[PDB]
Amino acid sequence: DQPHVVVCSGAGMGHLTPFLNLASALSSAPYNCKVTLLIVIPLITDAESHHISSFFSSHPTIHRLDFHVNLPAPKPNVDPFFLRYKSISDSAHRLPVHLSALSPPISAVFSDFLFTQGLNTTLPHLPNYTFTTTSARFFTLMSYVPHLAKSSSSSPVEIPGLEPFPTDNIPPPFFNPEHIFTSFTISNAKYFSLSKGILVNTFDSFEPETLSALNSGDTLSDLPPVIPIGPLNELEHNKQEELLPWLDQQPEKSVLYVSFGNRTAMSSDQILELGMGLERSDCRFIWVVKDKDDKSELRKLFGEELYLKLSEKGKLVKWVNQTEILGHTAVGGFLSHCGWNSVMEAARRGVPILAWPQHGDQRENAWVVEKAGLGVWEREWASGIQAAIVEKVKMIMGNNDLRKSAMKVGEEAKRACDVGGSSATALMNIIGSLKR
Structure with a gap:
């Protein structure tokens, strides 16, 4: 019973x-x-x-x-x-x-x-x-x-x-x-x-x-x-994620996953500076930005040169199965607004977080992430988006102390x-x- x-x-x-x-x-x-x-x-x-x-x-x-x-x-x-x-x-x-x-x-x-x-x-x-x-x-x-x-x-x-x-x-x-x-x-x-x-x-x-x-x-x-x-x-979602074969071709822990949630309130100018920053970082990435297999909004937004340079290194997509992305060994970090669902999905997988919180609970969540050793909170990311992404992406993907502490978060979460x-x-x- x-x-x-x-x-x-x-x-x-x-x-x-x-x-x-x-x-x-x-x-x-x-x-x-x-x-x-x-x-x-x-x-x-x-x-x-x-x-x-x-x-x-x-x-x-x-x-x-x-x-x-x-x-x-x-x-x-x-x-x-x-x-x-x-x-x-x-x-x-x-x-x-x-x-x-x-x-x-x-x-x-x-x-x-x-x-x-x-x-x-x-x-x-x-x-x-x-x-x-x-x-x-x-x-x-x-x-x-x-x-x-x-x-x-x-x-x-x-x-x-x-x-x-x-x-x-x-x-x-x-x-x-x-x-x-x-x-x-x-x-x-x-x-x-x-x-x-x-x-x-x-x-x-x-x-x-x-x-x-x-x-x-x-x-x-x-x-x-x-x-x-x-x-x-x-x-368990039906359809296995489409970017899994491409991720299977990327080196382990080499891909920055970028998603700010449906809530995010980022202007086109901010999206464009982020794109310029990711492009000059030359990192691999999966970026959920903005219905769509249309690149035209993305081509209009970035202009043709920046769009093509970004597409050489990463994927610009409408949606993903986020747990399947975060669970794949090629993903090395997670740029996020720090909504609590995203934090907890990253925690389960030990994925280091770069926290760019926007509103509501997100800045306290980012502090919790930083206190636990799961990530780093860029407090004034909005005051310099390009420099913020260029400087911190190498740390997210390469700092062994943060990778280690994030991995131990993942082990405790499991x-x-x-x-x-x-x-x-x-x-x-x-x-x-x-x-x-």
């Missing part, structure tokens, strides 16, 4: 991906749960819709539960995704009727933090594990957002027991309780204390000081136990999700607790 659990996903690819990974893991040995995956519809982007469709087509054993939340009307100067997050957070109180009708009766819910207030007030007797999609480090700052304000938009934020958060790494909205993002962050963080636990896509040896402080009581907060369950096993590992054991204990 086996428990029936609900995975309650939100919106946005960065948030959907780890939730899909969790549902896939829980539906499979060794957890062997019955999984219902809740999707919020309509979806905002066609990319989201396609990935959800491919997920269910390749995991036919997982049940889909559509939770319809009307799209809010767009408003000038308000980010569309924040408006959608707000509408989801405001709908969470409606989940009881939907989760109660599931059969067999569910044993637990693993939920996006936008559902926290709704779930923990309207279903207080159902174990709710809040699954954050960022680092333990940045999660701690988010849970502190109610206790700011009380403000001082201008001082490093000192949470007891942890290294202070510099102002430049904190999203400025966090100091304004009436900002749309802060509003539902406060609403849901105020109810973290009633979740059964906070799950994090991290592992003990990746953030030991932060996790130690949290679970010893040092932060003085009312959080439940914060439980690393990462890194989560990557999804051990964490291996049999007996710290993360596998934690998630097994959770699932075991549901078996009466």
Whole structure:
């Protein structure tokens, strides 16, 4: 006999991906749960819709539960995704009727933090594990957002027991309780204390000081136990990656993989300076830039000479299977915005990271990457893109100390999700607790 659990996903690819990974893991040995995956519809982007469709087509054993939340009307100067997050957070109180009708009766819910207030007030007797999609480090700052304000938009934020958060790494909205993002962050963080636990896509040896402080009581907060369950096993995708034969022809650890995520907000001038920098570095690369087998946007953007020089040394592509790229021995480094999904996929493979963080949690994530020895954070990459790439690419691909520390990160990450590992054991204990 086996428990029936609900995975309650939100919106946005960065948030959907780890939730899909969790549902896939829980539906499979060794957890062997019955999984219902809740999707919020309509979806905002066609990319989201396609990935959800491919997920269910390749995991036919997982049940889909559509939770319809009307799209809010767009408003000038308000980010569309924040408006959608707000509408989801405001709908969470409606989940009881939907989760109660599931059969067999569910044993637990693993939920996006936008559902926290709704779930923990309207279903207080159902174990709710809040699954954050960022680092333990940045999660701690988010849970502190109610206790700011009380403000001082201008001082490093000192949470007891942890290294202070510099102002430049904190999203400025966090100091304004009436900002749309802060509003539902406060609403849901105020109810973290009633979740059964906070799950994090991290592992003990990746953030030991932060996790130690949290679970010893040092932060003085009312959080439940914060439980690393990462890194989560990557999804087997259908189509093996097309660049694998070309990678098979490149020397070991010679290729720089470049991807800033769907979120990235880099101007054409920045993309062009990056291209000029990669070209003058003469490194091999795979670069996800900007539908497409069109090079014309790339030929227009770089102009014809730069485009052809770049294509001599690397691949300019629309999309890749990122875990298949990061897992290949020819890839020697990863230039990334440091979204937490990308960090954890690099960590699993011991791939050194060059961190060019852009916004949100990314600068604290880059600090975590640097603290763990997984990579190097170029703090002012935007102030000189060409020099930044030319100077640091040789270090990423050739510094033996960083290659060594990154490889040991990879060994600890594999051990964490291996049999007996710290993360596998934690998630097994959770699932075991549901078996009466």
